[PDB]
Amino acid sequence: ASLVASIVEARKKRTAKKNITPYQRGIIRSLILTLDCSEAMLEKDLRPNRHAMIIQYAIDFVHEFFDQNPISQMGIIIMRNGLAQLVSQVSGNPQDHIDALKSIRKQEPKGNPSLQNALEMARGLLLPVPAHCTREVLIVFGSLSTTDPGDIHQTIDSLVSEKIRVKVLGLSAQVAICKELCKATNYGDESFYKILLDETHLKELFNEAVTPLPVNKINKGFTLVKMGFPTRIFEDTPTFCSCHSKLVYGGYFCPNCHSKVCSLPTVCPCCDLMLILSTHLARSYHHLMPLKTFAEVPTTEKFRSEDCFSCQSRFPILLTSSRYRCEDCKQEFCVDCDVFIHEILHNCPGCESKPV
Amino acid sequence: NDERNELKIDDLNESYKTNYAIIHLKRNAHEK
Amino acid sequence: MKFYIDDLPVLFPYPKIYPEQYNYMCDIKKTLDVGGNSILEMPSGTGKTVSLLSLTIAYQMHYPEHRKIIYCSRTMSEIEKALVELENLMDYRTKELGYQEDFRGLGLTSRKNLCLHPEVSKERKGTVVDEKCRRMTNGQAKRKLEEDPEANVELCEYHENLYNIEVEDYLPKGVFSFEKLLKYCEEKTLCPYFIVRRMISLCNIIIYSYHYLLDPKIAERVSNEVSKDSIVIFDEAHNIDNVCIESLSLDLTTDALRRATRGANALDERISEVRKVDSQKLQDEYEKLVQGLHSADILTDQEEPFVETPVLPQDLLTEAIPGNIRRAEHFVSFLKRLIEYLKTRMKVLHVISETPKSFLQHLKQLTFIERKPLRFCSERLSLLVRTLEVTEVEDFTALKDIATFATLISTYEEGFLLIIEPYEIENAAVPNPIMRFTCLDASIAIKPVFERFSSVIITSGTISPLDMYPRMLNFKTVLQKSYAMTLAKKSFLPMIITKGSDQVAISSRFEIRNDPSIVRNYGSMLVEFAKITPDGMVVFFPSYLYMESIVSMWQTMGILDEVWKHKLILVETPDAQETSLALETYRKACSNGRGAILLSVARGKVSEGIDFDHQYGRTVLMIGIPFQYTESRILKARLEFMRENYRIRENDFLSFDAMRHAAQCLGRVLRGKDDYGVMVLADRRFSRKRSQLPKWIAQGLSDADLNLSTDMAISNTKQFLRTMAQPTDPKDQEGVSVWSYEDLIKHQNSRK
Lengths: 356, 32, 752
Ligand code: SF4
Ligand SMILES: [Zn+2]
Ligand SMILES: [Zn+2]
Ligand SMILES: [Zn+2]
Ligand SMILES: [Zn+2]
Known about the structure:
The structure is cut from a larger assembly and holds chains A (356 residues), B (32 residues) and C (752 residues). Chain B is an all-alpha fold.
């Protein structure tokens, strides 16, 4: 019954996963991550303290974010002494943001938070962003009160007019203004305001924000963006880089001005042209053609083979059949592959193998 | 106008419905 | 939605409905069809007013009888909420039936709340507003203007403009709230107060406060126009007895009598002046008095009597004037010596309580005033003043109080008591004698209402126990039941705290209000909760004096400085306008995330109609049981009357009275089922009152929460708030707490 208890719970966990449709998502993102560093974040509800754990998870989030969003940009803001302090400008270099976050980890948080100051700073940082990018703001709020110099409601109206999207992660309880901010700014959706219940749930919440947010039907900004694919060149002698002005062995050559760049993806320092490899675009295709989920086969019918199609793991005979089939190709898979096929891979081997 | 919205019971109104757009991607291209 | 009852189709203004609302509607329909009175206790977290309007409006529009609806609330603010809900419901009906049906609905209030005159609406007292309006609307100015246009007397364009149009065309068909009514009348220069009062006989549903139904002074004029078979609803009637008692109560001070002699002397001087120049008016009035006419036959419908009838219409004598006070001079002398007897009775040195009969006998002894002439004091005065051309009545205002006392003491003899105290304030350098006329029986004022109207519905959010109200008020109910909300997940956490973090017992007994340990223990509770409460916090104190003393102690200790760091502090004040601004600031602070804490009085103005749904209220801190001041002569006499007559124990009533107020405040936090909040009762004496709380609140109070400490309370509150912040599972409430149209049909099938 204990194993069956997992299965019935698994079926309930699979109930939400059943409804999957290819919703349009904005791959080009421009995220502004806001952190709360106030007196309320000195509590011990999160070990060792909220400030330490949040910073530690922020480092992990940065790594994951740039891993699945190679052509996006991020900016870091913190709240301190009732003011918003900029610590990282919008940039495509994951190392610069990580270094900035590490430095912040030392100073002790103090003072009160100010949403209006943080929102206003985020509003200005996203002003010089193309219209094809999705402007998003992620806030890690821990305080139950906000001290602002002006009217927060006016800022909320401005954010909606600027088509910015706000996600807020709370620590203790729901704040009415935060709920309004996450609702009025998301076309009335109320699922963008999440309050954690433990340390483990926080990791999932951070991981969820990595994926691009679906776009609204009435919000259309379709356009073509000019991109370039530079060719890597190997040089015998070091040469000055056009981005940092330092001697480096080799760098990718822009096909529009031949200027060299240390690393990709980055905006060309000469023609202001985005340099991206073909692999970077390939990293986001799984969000446009997501692999359809697998449905377990009832034990009443007869199974095809005793071994897994993909990993050759012998199916445990033992009640409920531990087999999941693909509707497109109708090939049974073990429980292990389905997790690996939907988290690591994004293509069904059975469908590819079938000839047409 | 503003007072009317406050006095109404939101919980009894129709649940918010998502209005996200769907995309179907056709796949075809010329050979190298 | 639009579902069906046994034979009555009802249109709900929402696509969804709670199980309680449908059960509430079914019981109401049964009572209306069967006849009689009933007492229904519906939870505050479920739509009550909307359910009442939906069913009752459909009932009047479907059955051939087309019985009218009378809605009685406790405060003017509640009338606005009811009208707004009515407008929303009627809009839904107009959109589903395809046309605007013949329907009229208006709210009622005093001139102060509906006066548009640029010079008369700027007054801080309602009595002055009434006097000015009567001067411009009595008709003396109009009659004087007709005779001689040169007269400087002015008119009211709003009142004058109404004569052009007929009564049926004052307002277009539909429902007009106060906010909408003023805007429509301002654009046409009309008086909303006169428009409403002249259309009561034409309104399908009429909404007014309890004072307009139970107080004989103002109820008689309004009651004379309403129908006899109309539906009567008593919403939030858990404190109706206080209104009933205050209607037939009066207080006389030394200053009131001192101001009465000056008015009486002025009245005599005015009579002498009129006697010299214009004596025909007195003779004309005297001739009618000899005939046997009264104020009703003499005064026109346009004008109002100077002294409002202080007794019920059924207790007024229909015989002619006795003859002693038939003449102006004789009546003035009668009035003058009556004042002296009151003055000489204010020199007592110890509290004396006597029945009206004993007072009358002593009055008949020292002087020679009989009972019958005393009963006509108010009626006679209104006639004399009206005929005296008293355009300015500032001097005679005090005489109204004496006339009211004379007509009250000489009319009722059972259930009334007369209290004379040598110390109005026990802590006073100089004694301040006071004469109080108190009404002990609470059913005297409401007896005519329960007899004139066949069907009456009494509903409130915290009316419990239901058995006592029929005992206190002499009436019988066909059914009396209370509903329990079927909430899928716990939405409110009621807790009782008996001791502080140091395990020291905490109580709000007045004798120990100045205790460093209790004051600190309560202060620690306030600070600790304010740290976890997200946006709003309402704090209710047993009495305003208790709040003043304890708040001042906190200021000296330094508790407030710590509270200021987290939330803004707003405090209720005796001034009504200042308190209203505080609520506006408190609501603004909670909406913008600044966070605010409101300190109020459980028996104050806030608790009698102000709501804190969602953000404006997330935690209720009841600082002590709101016990009444036991060492009160008025209260002690009231308790004795109930014990001897209704066999109600003194302790039981006192506990019931205190709990009915504590529960009242608790129900002002939940709107719908998506609303949540933590209710903490901070007193060691709440531990044994669980059985006395409302059923829907008691069911939510666990056995482990009956006696908690401050530290344990915070831990539970933090856990509860965290739990309520998660996305609710829709399947957990698809058909167990909220019903769609399909689910409602299923319930009607299984039940049948
Ligand atoms: S008639 Fe109406 S507007 Fe004119 S003074 Fe009286 S209440 Fe005010
Ligand atoms: Zn470089
Ligand atoms: Zn270039
Ligand atoms: Zn496998
Ligand atoms: Zn497949």
